[PDB]
Design a protein around this ligand. Sequence first.
Ligand SMILES: [K+]
Ligand SMILES: [K+]
Lengths: 66, 66
Amino acid sequence: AADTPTACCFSYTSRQIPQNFIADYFETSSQCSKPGVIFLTKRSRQVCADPSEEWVQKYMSDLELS
Amino acid sequence: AADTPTACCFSYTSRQIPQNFIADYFETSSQCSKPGVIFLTKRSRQVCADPSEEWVQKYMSDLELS
Ligand SMILES: [K+]
Ligand SMILES: [K+]
């Protein structure tokens, strides 16, 4: 779809999510005031995270290279 | 939940949704650049709409008074 809500982050998790919790991720629209990475856990919980944090660039890379 | 994505509207539907399509609604965070009403249809499609439009204030009222 399209013309439909877009997810935005207004706060970032403060602590590193354990990596084996992570099932997927995506980056939030550039239309959002903040840059965001939303991780999806295995229980399908969505979690906002700061793209400029080392551990999140880690998790993104590991996810992409598999 | 909380610390999790928030829905934002960046465009509004251009045409009035038929009222019998509507199943629910909510208003988007004041943190979003735009004011928004998101209608949920019976097929669970989410639809962004302009709160300053007469027909959407209509639909909100009708939904609340039932
Ligand atoms: K921006
Ligand atoms: K605002």
